[PDB]
mmCIF file of C-alpha atoms and ligand atoms in Angstrom:
data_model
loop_
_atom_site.group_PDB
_atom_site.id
_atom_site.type_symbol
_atom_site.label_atom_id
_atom_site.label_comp_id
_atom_site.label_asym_id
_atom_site.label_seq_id
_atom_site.Cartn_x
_atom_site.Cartn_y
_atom_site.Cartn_z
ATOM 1 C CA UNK A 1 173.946 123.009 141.815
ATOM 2 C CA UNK A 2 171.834 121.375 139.020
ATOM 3 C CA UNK A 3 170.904 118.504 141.607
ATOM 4 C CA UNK A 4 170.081 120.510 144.621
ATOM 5 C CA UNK A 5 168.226 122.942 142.595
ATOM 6 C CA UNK A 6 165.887 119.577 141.533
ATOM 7 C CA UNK A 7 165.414 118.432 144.706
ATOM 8 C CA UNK A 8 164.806 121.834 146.365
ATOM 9 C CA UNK A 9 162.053 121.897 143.714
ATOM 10 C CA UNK A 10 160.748 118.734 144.056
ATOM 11 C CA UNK A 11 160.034 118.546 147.690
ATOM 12 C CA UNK A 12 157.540 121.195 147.795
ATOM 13 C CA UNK A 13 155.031 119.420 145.744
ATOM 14 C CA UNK A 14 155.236 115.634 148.486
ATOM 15 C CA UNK A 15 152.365 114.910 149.159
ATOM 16 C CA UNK A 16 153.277 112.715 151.756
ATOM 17 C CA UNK A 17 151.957 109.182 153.413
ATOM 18 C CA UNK A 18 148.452 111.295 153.241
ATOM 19 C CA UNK A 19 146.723 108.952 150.765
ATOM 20 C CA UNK A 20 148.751 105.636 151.769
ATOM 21 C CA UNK A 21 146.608 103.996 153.803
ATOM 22 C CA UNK A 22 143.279 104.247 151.709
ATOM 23 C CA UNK A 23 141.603 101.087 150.784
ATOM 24 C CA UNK A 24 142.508 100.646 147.175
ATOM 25 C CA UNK A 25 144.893 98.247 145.262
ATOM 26 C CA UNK A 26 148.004 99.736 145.356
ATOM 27 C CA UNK A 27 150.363 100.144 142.727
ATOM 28 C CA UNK A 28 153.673 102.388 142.855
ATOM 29 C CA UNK A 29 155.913 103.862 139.934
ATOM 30 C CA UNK A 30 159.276 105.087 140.029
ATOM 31 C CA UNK A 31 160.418 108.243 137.866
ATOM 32 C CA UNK A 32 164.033 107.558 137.693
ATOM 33 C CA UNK A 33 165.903 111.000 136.990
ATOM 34 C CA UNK A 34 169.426 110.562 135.283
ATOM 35 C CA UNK A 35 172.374 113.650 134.998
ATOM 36 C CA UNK A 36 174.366 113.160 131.604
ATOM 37 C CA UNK A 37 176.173 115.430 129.574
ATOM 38 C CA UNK A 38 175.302 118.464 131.934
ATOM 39 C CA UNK A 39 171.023 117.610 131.993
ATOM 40 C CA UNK A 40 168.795 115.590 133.007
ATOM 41 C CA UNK A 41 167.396 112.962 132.092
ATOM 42 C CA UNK A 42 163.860 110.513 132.602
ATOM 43 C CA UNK A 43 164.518 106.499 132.565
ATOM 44 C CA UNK A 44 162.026 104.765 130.769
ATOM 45 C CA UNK A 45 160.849 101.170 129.642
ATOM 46 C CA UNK A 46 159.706 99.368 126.989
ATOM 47 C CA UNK A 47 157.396 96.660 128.583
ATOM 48 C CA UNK A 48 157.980 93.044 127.201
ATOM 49 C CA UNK A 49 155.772 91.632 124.622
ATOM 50 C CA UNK A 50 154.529 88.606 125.960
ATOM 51 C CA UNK A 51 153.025 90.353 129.437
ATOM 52 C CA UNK A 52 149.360 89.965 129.629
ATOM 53 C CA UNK A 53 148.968 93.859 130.904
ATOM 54 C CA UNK A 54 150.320 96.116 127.900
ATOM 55 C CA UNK A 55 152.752 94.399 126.210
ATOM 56 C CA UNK A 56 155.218 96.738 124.245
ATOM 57 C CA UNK A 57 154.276 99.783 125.795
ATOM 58 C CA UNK A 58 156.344 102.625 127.095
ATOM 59 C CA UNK A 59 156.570 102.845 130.783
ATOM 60 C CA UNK A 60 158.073 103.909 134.182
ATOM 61 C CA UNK A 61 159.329 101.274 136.469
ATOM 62 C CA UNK A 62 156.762 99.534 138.990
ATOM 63 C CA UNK A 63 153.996 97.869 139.863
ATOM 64 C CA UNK A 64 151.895 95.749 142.358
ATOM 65 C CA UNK A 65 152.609 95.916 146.075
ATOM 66 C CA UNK A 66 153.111 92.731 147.843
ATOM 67 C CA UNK A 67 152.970 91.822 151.513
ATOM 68 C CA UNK A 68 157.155 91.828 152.044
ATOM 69 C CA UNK A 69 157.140 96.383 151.108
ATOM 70 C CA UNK A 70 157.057 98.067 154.067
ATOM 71 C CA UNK A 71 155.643 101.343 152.822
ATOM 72 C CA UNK A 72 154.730 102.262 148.957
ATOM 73 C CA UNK A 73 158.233 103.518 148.257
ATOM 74 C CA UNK A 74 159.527 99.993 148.965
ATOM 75 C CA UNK A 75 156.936 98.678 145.933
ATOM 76 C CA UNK A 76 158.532 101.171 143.370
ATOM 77 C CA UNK A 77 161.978 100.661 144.957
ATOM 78 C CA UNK A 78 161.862 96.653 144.439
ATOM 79 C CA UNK A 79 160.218 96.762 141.095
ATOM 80 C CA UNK A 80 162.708 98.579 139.741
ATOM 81 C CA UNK A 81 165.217 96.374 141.011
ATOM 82 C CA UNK A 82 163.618 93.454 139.278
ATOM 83 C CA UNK A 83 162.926 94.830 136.327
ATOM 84 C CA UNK A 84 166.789 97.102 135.570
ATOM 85 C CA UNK A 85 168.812 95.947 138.257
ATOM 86 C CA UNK A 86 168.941 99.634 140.054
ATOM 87 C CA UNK A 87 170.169 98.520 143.425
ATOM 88 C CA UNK A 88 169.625 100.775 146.685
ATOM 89 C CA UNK A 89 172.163 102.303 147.233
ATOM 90 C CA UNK A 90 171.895 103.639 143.276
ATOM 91 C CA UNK A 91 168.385 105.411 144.223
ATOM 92 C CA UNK A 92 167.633 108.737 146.388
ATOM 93 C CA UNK A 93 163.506 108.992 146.723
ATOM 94 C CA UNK A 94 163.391 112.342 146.674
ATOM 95 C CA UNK A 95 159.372 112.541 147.002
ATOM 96 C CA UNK A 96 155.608 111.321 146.276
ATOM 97 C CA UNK A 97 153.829 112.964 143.962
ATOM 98 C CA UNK A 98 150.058 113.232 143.341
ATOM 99 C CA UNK A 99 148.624 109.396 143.110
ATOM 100 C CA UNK A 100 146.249 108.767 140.202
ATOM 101 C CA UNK A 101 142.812 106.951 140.421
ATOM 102 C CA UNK A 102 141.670 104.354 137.718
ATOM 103 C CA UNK A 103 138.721 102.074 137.351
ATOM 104 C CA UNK A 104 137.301 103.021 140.644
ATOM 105 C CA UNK A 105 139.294 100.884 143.140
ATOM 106 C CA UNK A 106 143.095 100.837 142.341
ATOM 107 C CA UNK A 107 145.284 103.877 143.265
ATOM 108 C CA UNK A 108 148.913 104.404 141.650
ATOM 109 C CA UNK A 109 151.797 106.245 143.781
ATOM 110 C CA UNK A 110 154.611 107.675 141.780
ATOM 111 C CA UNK A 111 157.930 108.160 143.558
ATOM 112 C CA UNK A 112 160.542 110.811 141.923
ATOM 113 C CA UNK A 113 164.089 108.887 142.212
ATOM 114 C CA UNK A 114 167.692 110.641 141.544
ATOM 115 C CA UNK A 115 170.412 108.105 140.373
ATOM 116 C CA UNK A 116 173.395 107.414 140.904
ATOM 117 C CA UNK A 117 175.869 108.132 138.049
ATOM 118 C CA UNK A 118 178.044 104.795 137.464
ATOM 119 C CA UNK A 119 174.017 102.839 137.428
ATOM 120 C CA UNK A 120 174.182 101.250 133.978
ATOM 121 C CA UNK A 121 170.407 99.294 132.909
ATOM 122 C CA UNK A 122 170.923 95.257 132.935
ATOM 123 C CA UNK A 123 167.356 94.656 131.657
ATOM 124 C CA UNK A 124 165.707 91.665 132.111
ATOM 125 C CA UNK A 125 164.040 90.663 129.454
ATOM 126 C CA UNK A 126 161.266 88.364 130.954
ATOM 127 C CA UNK A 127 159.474 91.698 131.491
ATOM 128 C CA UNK A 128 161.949 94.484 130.158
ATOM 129 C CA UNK A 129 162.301 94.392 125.979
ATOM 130 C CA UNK A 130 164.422 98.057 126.265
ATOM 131 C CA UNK A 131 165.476 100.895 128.149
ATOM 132 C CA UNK A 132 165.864 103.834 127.469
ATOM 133 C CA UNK A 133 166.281 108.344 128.136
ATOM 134 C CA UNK A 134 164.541 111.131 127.571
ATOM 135 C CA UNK A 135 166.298 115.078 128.136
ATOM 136 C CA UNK A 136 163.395 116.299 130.630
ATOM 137 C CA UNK A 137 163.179 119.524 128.428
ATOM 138 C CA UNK A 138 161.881 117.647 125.684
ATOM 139 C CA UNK A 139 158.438 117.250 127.720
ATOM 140 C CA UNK A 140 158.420 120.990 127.342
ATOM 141 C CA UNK A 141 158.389 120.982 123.358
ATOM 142 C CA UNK A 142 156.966 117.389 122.582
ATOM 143 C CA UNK A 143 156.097 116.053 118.977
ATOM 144 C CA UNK A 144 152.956 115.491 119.392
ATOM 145 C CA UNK A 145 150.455 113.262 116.984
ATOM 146 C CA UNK A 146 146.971 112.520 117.307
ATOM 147 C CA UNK A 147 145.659 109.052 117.715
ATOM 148 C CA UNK A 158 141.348 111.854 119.094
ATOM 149 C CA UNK A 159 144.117 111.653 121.120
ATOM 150 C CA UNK A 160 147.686 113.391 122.467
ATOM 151 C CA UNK A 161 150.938 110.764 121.708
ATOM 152 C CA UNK A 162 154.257 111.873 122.267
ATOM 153 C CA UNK A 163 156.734 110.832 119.598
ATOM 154 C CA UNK A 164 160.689 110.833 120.300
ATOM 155 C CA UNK A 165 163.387 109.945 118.414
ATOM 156 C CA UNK A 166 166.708 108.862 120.146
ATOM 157 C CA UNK A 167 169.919 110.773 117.673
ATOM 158 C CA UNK A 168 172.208 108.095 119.253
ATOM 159 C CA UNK A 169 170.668 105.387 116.786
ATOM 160 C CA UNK A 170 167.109 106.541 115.068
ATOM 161 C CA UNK A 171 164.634 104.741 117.003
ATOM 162 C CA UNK A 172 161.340 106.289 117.693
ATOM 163 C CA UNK A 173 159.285 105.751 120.691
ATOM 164 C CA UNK A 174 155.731 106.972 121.304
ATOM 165 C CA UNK A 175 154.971 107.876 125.388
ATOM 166 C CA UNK A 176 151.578 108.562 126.240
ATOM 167 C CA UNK A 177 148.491 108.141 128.696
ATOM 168 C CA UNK A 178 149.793 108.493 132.738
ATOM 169 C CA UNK A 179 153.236 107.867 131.608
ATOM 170 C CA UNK A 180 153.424 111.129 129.353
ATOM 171 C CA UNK A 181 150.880 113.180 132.192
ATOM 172 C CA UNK A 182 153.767 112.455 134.740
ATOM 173 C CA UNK A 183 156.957 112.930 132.195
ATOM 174 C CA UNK A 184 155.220 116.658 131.465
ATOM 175 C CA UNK A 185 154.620 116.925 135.521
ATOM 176 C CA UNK A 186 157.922 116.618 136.791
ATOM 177 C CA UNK A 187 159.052 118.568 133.283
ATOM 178 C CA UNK A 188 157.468 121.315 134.455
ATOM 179 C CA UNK A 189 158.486 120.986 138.349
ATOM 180 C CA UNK A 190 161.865 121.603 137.916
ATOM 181 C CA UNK A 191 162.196 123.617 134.413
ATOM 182 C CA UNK A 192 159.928 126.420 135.153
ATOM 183 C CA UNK A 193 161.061 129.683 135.932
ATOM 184 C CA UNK A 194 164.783 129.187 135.135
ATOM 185 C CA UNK A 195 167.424 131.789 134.286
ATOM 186 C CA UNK A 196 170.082 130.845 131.308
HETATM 187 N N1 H0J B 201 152.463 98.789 133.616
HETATM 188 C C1 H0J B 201 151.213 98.853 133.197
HETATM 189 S S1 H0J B 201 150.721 99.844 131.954
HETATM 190 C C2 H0J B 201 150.264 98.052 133.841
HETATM 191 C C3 H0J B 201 150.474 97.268 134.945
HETATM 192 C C4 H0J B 201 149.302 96.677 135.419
HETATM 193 C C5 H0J B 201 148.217 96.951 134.633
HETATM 194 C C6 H0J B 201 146.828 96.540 134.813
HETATM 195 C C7 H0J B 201 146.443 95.702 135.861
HETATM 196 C C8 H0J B 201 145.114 95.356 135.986
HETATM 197 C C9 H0J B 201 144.206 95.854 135.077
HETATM 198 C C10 H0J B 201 144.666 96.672 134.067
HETATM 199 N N2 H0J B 201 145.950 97.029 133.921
HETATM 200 S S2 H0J B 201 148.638 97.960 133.299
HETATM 201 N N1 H0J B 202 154.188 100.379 135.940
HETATM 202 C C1 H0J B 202 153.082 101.031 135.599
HETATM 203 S S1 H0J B 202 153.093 102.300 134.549
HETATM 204 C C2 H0J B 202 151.784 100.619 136.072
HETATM 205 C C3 H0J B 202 151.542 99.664 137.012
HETATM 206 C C4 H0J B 202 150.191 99.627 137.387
HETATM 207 C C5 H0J B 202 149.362 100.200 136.468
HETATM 208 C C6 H0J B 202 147.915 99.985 136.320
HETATM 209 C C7 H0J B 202 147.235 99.088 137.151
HETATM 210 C C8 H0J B 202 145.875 98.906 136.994
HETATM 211 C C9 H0J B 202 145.219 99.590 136.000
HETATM 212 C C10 H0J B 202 145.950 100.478 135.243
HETATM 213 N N2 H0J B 202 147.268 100.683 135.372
HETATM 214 S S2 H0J B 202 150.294 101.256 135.459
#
Protein backbone atom coordinates (compact mmCIF):
# COMPACT_ATOMS: atom_id res chain seq x y z
CA UNK A 1 0.00 0.00 0.00
CA UNK A 2 0.70 3.79 -0.23
CA UNK A 3 1.79 3.67 3.59
CA UNK A 4 3.95 0.65 3.61
CA UNK A 5 5.51 1.65 0.45
CA UNK A 6 6.62 5.11 2.62
CA UNK A 7 7.85 3.46 5.34
CA UNK A 8 9.66 0.66 3.45
CA UNK A 9 11.35 3.72 1.89
CA UNK A 10 12.00 5.60 4.69
CA UNK A 11 13.80 3.20 6.87
CA UNK A 12 16.69 2.71 4.72
CA UNK A 13 17.97 6.16 5.02
CA UNK A 14 17.87 5.96 9.69
CA UNK A 15 20.59 6.93 10.65
CA UNK A 16 20.13 5.73 13.93
CA UNK A 17 21.14 6.81 17.77
CA UNK A 18 24.76 7.20 15.90
CA UNK A 19 25.06 10.97 16.44
CA UNK A 20 22.82 11.14 19.77
CA UNK A 21 25.12 11.27 22.25
CA UNK A 22 27.56 14.02 20.84
CA UNK A 23 28.14 17.01 22.93
CA UNK A 24 26.05 19.64 21.28
CA UNK A 25 22.72 21.43 22.22
CA UNK A 26 20.20 19.38 21.06
CA UNK A 27 17.25 20.26 19.27
CA UNK A 28 14.71 17.73 17.51
CA UNK A 29 12.01 18.33 14.67
CA UNK A 30 9.19 16.32 13.74
CA UNK A 31 8.10 15.89 9.92
CA UNK A 32 4.57 14.98 10.42
CA UNK A 33 3.34 13.01 7.19
CA UNK A 34 -0.56 13.18 6.63
CA UNK A 35 -2.72 10.66 3.93
CA UNK A 36 -5.76 12.74 2.45
CA UNK A 37 -7.61 12.41 -0.55
CA UNK A 38 -5.41 9.37 -1.75
CA UNK A 39 -1.62 11.42 -1.04
CA UNK A 40 0.34 12.56 1.18
CA UNK A 41 0.78 15.16 2.84
CA UNK A 42 3.70 17.40 5.12
CA UNK A 43 2.24 19.26 8.43
CA UNK A 44 3.59 22.49 8.85
CA UNK A 45 3.56 25.67 11.19
CA UNK A 46 3.37 29.07 11.19
CA UNK A 47 5.45 30.15 14.30
CA UNK A 48 3.71 32.85 16.53
CA UNK A 49 4.61 36.40 16.24
CA UNK A 50 5.56 37.43 19.49
CA UNK A 51 8.44 34.45 19.97
CA UNK A 52 11.80 35.92 20.37
CA UNK A 53 13.39 33.08 17.86
CA UNK A 54 11.64 33.68 14.32
CA UNK A 55 8.49 34.92 14.81
CA UNK A 56 6.07 34.26 11.80
CA UNK A 57 8.08 31.86 10.13
CA UNK A 58 7.19 28.60 8.52
CA UNK A 59 8.22 25.58 10.40
CA UNK A 60 8.16 21.86 11.43
CA UNK A 61 7.19 20.99 14.91
CA UNK A 62 10.01 20.96 17.74
CA UNK A 63 12.50 22.23 19.58
CA UNK A 64 14.80 22.23 22.72
CA UNK A 65 15.38 19.04 24.67
CA UNK A 66 14.82 19.15 28.30
CA UNK A 67 15.95 16.87 31.11
CA UNK A 68 12.26 14.85 31.43
CA UNK A 69 12.93 13.21 27.13
CA UNK A 70 14.32 10.11 27.39
CA UNK A 71 15.91 9.90 23.97
CA UNK A 72 15.69 12.73 21.04
CA UNK A 73 12.49 11.26 19.63
CA UNK A 74 10.79 12.05 22.96
CA UNK A 75 11.92 16.04 22.33
CA UNK A 76 10.14 16.09 18.85
CA UNK A 77 7.37 13.81 20.19
CA UNK A 78 6.47 16.33 23.22
CA UNK A 79 6.92 19.46 21.24
CA UNK A 80 4.57 18.59 19.00
CA UNK A 81 2.20 17.80 21.56
CA UNK A 82 2.51 21.25 22.99
CA UNK A 83 2.48 23.05 20.20
CA UNK A 84 -0.86 20.96 17.92
CA UNK A 85 -2.09 18.73 20.40
CA UNK A 86 -0.86 15.40 18.35
CA UNK A 87 -1.13 12.93 21.17
CA UNK A 88 0.90 9.48 21.12
CA UNK A 89 -0.94 7.29 20.18
CA UNK A 90 -1.70 9.72 16.86
CA UNK A 91 2.22 9.44 15.89
CA UNK A 92 4.31 6.35 14.34
CA UNK A 93 8.28 7.55 14.28
CA UNK A 94 9.07 5.90 11.47
CA UNK A 95 12.93 7.10 11.46
CA UNK A 96 15.91 9.74 12.04
CA UNK A 97 17.15 11.34 9.37
CA UNK A 98 20.48 13.13 8.77
CA UNK A 99 20.92 15.85 11.80
CA UNK A 100 22.04 19.31 10.68
CA UNK A 101 24.90 21.41 12.28
CA UNK A 102 24.53 25.26 12.91
CA UNK A 103 26.66 27.86 14.57
CA UNK A 104 29.23 25.40 15.62
CA UNK A 105 27.75 23.84 18.80
CA UNK A 106 23.98 23.01 18.42
CA UNK A 107 22.90 19.88 16.44
CA UNK A 108 19.14 19.44 15.13
CA UNK A 109 17.55 15.74 14.82
CA UNK A 110 14.61 15.44 12.53
CA UNK A 111 12.22 12.55 13.15
CA UNK A 112 9.84 11.42 10.06
CA UNK A 113 6.26 10.83 11.85
CA UNK A 114 3.09 9.03 10.05
CA UNK A 115 -0.33 10.19 11.52
CA UNK A 116 -3.06 9.00 12.41
CA UNK A 117 -6.11 9.85 10.24
CA UNK A 118 -9.01 11.18 12.70
CA UNK A 119 -5.72 13.78 14.26
CA UNK A 120 -7.32 17.17 13.65
CA UNK A 121 -4.60 20.46 14.65
CA UNK A 122 -5.91 22.33 18.01
CA UNK A 123 -3.16 25.00 17.77
CA UNK A 124 -2.12 26.84 20.49
CA UNK A 125 -1.65 30.03 19.82
CA UNK A 126 0.91 31.15 22.54
CA UNK A 127 3.44 29.70 20.06
CA UNK A 128 1.31 28.32 17.03
CA UNK A 129 -0.39 31.42 14.77
CA UNK A 130 -1.49 28.48 11.91
CA UNK A 131 -1.25 25.16 10.62
CA UNK A 132 -1.22 24.01 7.80
CA UNK A 133 -0.44 21.00 4.44
CA UNK A 134 1.57 20.66 1.80
CA UNK A 135 0.96 17.50 -1.14
CA UNK A 136 4.70 16.09 -0.78
CA UNK A 137 4.86 16.18 -4.69
CA UNK A 138 4.78 19.74 -4.68
CA UNK A 139 8.53 19.73 -3.24
CA UNK A 140 9.21 18.08 -6.55
CA UNK A 141 7.94 21.14 -8.77
CA UNK A 142 8.25 24.14 -6.24
CA UNK A 143 7.60 27.92 -7.15
CA UNK A 144 10.52 29.11 -6.48
CA UNK A 145 11.58 33.07 -6.00
CA UNK A 146 14.74 34.55 -5.23
CA UNK A 147 15.36 36.54 -2.14
CA UNK A 148 20.37 35.70 -3.73
CA UNK A 149 18.43 33.19 -2.40
CA UNK A 150 15.94 29.88 -3.06
CA UNK A 151 12.14 30.57 -1.28
CA UNK A 152 9.49 28.29 -1.86
CA UNK A 153 6.12 29.91 -2.47
CA UNK A 154 2.70 27.85 -2.05
CA UNK A 155 -0.58 28.70 -2.35
CA UNK A 156 -3.31 26.66 -0.45
CA UNK A 157 -6.68 26.32 -3.40
CA UNK A 158 -8.84 25.62 -0.27
CA UNK A 159 -8.78 29.50 0.58
CA UNK A 160 -5.82 31.59 -1.37
CA UNK A 161 -3.28 32.00 1.19
CA UNK A 162 0.30 31.94 0.26
CA UNK A 163 3.06 30.72 2.37
CA UNK A 164 6.79 31.00 1.67
CA UNK A 165 9.01 27.70 3.20
CA UNK A 166 12.56 28.01 3.08
CA UNK A 167 16.11 27.54 4.78
CA UNK A 168 16.29 23.78 6.76
CA UNK A 169 12.62 23.63 6.67
CA UNK A 170 12.40 23.59 2.71
CA UNK A 171 16.10 21.34 2.58
CA UNK A 172 14.11 18.66 4.63
CA UNK A 173 10.44 19.12 2.84
CA UNK A 174 12.59 18.42 -0.68
CA UNK A 175 14.51 15.42 1.37
CA UNK A 176 11.81 13.33 2.36
CA UNK A 177 10.04 14.56 -1.21
CA UNK A 178 12.46 12.85 -2.85
CA UNK A 179 12.71 9.66 -0.39
CA UNK A 180 9.59 8.37 -1.11
CA UNK A 181 8.57 9.87 -4.74
CA UNK A 182 11.49 8.72 -6.67
CA UNK A 183 11.38 6.00 -8.93
CA UNK A 184 7.58 5.43 -8.93
CA UNK A 185 5.42 3.71 -11.54
CA UNK A 186 1.80 5.44 -12.40
N1 LIG B 1 12.08 27.11 15.32
C1 LIG B 1 13.11 27.88 15.02
S1 LIG B 1 13.37 28.50 13.50
C2 LIG B 1 14.03 28.17 16.03
C3 LIG B 1 14.03 27.65 17.30
C4 LIG B 1 15.14 28.05 18.05
C5 LIG B 1 15.94 28.92 17.37
C6 LIG B 1 17.19 29.54 17.80
C7 LIG B 1 17.71 29.32 19.08
C8 LIG B 1 18.91 29.92 19.43
C9 LIG B 1 19.55 30.70 18.50
C10 LIG B 1 18.97 30.87 17.26
N2 LIG B 1 17.82 30.30 16.89
S2 LIG B 1 15.33 29.26 15.79
N1 LIG C 1 11.58 23.84 15.31
C1 LIG C 1 12.62 24.19 14.57
S1 LIG C 1 12.54 24.33 12.93
C2 LIG C 1 13.89 24.55 15.17
C3 LIG C 1 14.21 24.42 16.48
C4 LIG C 1 15.57 24.67 16.71
C5 LIG C 1 16.16 25.40 15.72
C6 LIG C 1 17.40 26.18 15.80
C7 LIG C 1 18.11 26.27 17.00
C8 LIG C 1 19.28 27.01 17.06
C9 LIG C 1 19.70 27.67 15.93
C10 LIG C 1 18.97 27.51 14.77
N2 LIG C 1 17.84 26.79 14.69
S2 LIG C 1 15.20 25.26 14.28
Amino acid sequence: SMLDDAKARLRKYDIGGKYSHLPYNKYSVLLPLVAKEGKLHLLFTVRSEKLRRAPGEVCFPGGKRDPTDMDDAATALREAQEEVGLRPHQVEVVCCLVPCLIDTDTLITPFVGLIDHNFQAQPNPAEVKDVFLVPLAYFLHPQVHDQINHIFEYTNPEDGVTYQIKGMTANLAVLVAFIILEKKPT
